[PDB]
Amino acid sequence: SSHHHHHHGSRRNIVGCRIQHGWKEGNGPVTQWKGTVLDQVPVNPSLYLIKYDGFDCVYGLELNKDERVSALEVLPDRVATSRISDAHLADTMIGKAVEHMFETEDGSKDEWRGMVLARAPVMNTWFYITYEKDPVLYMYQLLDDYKEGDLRIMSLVGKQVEYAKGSKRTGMVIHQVEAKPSVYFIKFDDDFHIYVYDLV
């Protein structure tokens, strides 16, 4: 965000780019983060959706405006053009409820009910997914899970929302899932997770 002067500020298009930056929360140390920018929210173009290396959840961050971000560098690395291994499975998987198997410590089975929401932008071979017992936005290469037998297959945008916790968290509806139009992405203030709910 450069003040190309006075009332104007210009901004590089970083959708699809690898980025790295520092992160400082309160009186902690700066931590180092490296991620792939997936999208820029239409109803709030300073808000980006980001997949960070080593974190399964997708995060929503105002990368240019959030004071907690420092030394924001967009990298020259280009995400490799991948073709999806089984396109038919990939396409038919969208919008479907799924049983996604996860291991806990020393191999006890933990099966999570979920819903595949979409093919991820930018990172072609990855899928947007959320879970009944954890309604935030996750990202995984599900065709790997499927081939290993670990995956079994079975507009309000712009509006604000409020959610009761003896508290109230307010948030905004930022995206409608194309495969299932009654399912939306929600970004709450002071939470960088993307929440996923059916708002029927």
């Binding site: 974190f55 198997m101 996860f102 291991e103 089975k109």
Partner: peptide, 7 residues
């Protein structure tokens, strides 16, 4: 199968 991380 995958392992679950934490928030």
């Amino acid at each position: 199968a995958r392992t679950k991380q934490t928030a």
